[PDB]
């Protein structure tokens, strides 16, 4: 009866940091994914299940729309079978992922002069995430034998680091906003 609310998740005013990525559930709606496809404003529109053009031609039980900010350098890791700080400790797609990964510059919005330190990523982790896991804990990383006692110092590290997003950054070091649509009754087109 009414359109899927994709402007809420794509056009939203702020995005999550990748370690605490947001996920929007989407049911009881109908939308064409071609207000998306023919936008021509996307740096990545890497799809896995289906072809991007023929997408509003099909129905699924549920669809999720995950959204975060990473470095464009790093959009490489938002795809099944990747490894790296981000695919391992921040956001991991499963090997049998069916959906699309969408990205675009954000240097206008998410870049502050002198550095927008709001956006973070998980740098330390004893073992890397399972598919679609979210770990927002902030306990001091124990790299030594000495216990950390919650105090940051040598071999006792804060697991999150802050992007120094600056407008003068090369495009690899620029903010990119990313939306991951995954598909598995109630969505159609």
């Amino acid at each position, epitope marked *: 009866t009414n359109l899927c609310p994709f402007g809420e998740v794509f056009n939203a005013t702020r995005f999550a940091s990748v370690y605490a990525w947001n996920r929007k559930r989407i049911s009881n709606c109908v939308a064409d994914y071609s207000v998306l496809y023919n936008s021509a404003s996307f740096s990545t529109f890497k799809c896995y299940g289906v072809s991007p053009t023929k997408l509003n031609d099909l129905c699924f039980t549920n669809v999720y729309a995950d959204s975060f900010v990473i470095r464009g*350098d790093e959009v490489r890791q938002i795809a099944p079978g990747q490894t790296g*700080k981000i695919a391992d400790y921040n956001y991991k797609l499963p090997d049998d992922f069916t959906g699309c990964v969408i990205a675009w510059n954000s240097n206008n919005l998410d870049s502050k002069v002198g550095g927008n330190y709001n956006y973070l990523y998980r740098l330390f982790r*004893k073992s*890397n995430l399972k598919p679609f896991e979210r770990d927002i804990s902030t306990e001091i990383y124990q790299a*030594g034998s000495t216990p950390c006692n919650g105090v940051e110092g040598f071999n006792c*590290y804060f697991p999150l*680091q802050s992007y120094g997003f600056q407008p003068t*950054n*090369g*495009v690899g070091y620029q903010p990119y906003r990313v939306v991951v649509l995954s598909f598995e009754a109630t969505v159609c087109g």
Partner: antibody, heavy 115, light 108 residues
């Protein structure tokens, strides 16, 4: 408080070797580690890295021939060197990466690849 | 496959001078260059990491700056224990690279 390397020596071209780097305050299984080599009187060459989560990466120069691994039970980082060539001769250093910054370095062992 | 090019190869300066090593990246590396000192026969010392930050325990005469491609490492007051080869090291792109190396000789 230190990284103690061993296992380097003389190996036949095409031979095999495994280096050891045993640690004293760091925990290899919880920490970032990379192997860096230096052929005699030449520059440095980063070779391999292992992440806290276990993900491994190699320089194309040694990929498929070398393999980085660790044993928590002995707190030791290894570098297996298979199919050795002459240009693999040099000093091999292990380093603790502070997540991509190699801050503490081992003193090195000499892998000499000659007939 | 980012190529780091330092200069000079060889450098001769007398005690207390101001010594300056530059290192330029082929592509963009942001602040993810860091600077090493390798005394003859020992392993390298990390001096400055993240392009500009002084590693815990290092003398204040060592300093470096730069972001993107052009980087500068500077010794403010040359000392006798500073003979070594100094290397810049790119670390954020996969194939990690070093510069050529700068052989520093004390003049006397």
């Amino acid at each position: 408080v230190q990284l103690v390397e061993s296992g380097g020596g003389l190996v036949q071209p095409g031979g095999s070797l495994r280096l050891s780097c045993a640690a004293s305050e760091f925990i290899v299984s919880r920490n970032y580690m990379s192997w860096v080599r230096q052929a005699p009187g030449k520059g440095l060459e980063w070779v391999s890295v292992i992440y806290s989560g276990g993900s491994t990466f190699y320089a194309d120069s040694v990929k498929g021939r070398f393999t980085i691994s660790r044993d928590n039970s002995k707190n030791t980082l290894y570098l297996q060197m298979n199919s050795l060539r002459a240009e693999d001769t040099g000093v091999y250093y292990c380093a603790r990466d502070r997540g991509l910054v190699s801050d503490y370095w081992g003193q090195g062992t000499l892998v000499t690849v000659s007939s | 496959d980012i190529q780091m090019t330092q200069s000079p190869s060889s450098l001769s300066a007398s005690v207390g001078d101001r010594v300056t090593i530059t290192c330029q990246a082929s592509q963009d590396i942001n602040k993810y260059l860091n600077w090493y000192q390798q005394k003859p026969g020992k392993a390298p010392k990390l001096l400055i990491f993240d392009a500009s930050h002084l590693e815990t325990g290092v003398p204040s005469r060592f300093s470096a700056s730069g972001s993107g491609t052009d980087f500068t490492f500077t010794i403010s007051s040359l000392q006798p224990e500073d003979i070594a080869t100094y290397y810049c090291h790119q670390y954020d792109n996969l194939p990690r690279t070093f510069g050529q190396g700068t052989r520093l000789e004390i003049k006397r």
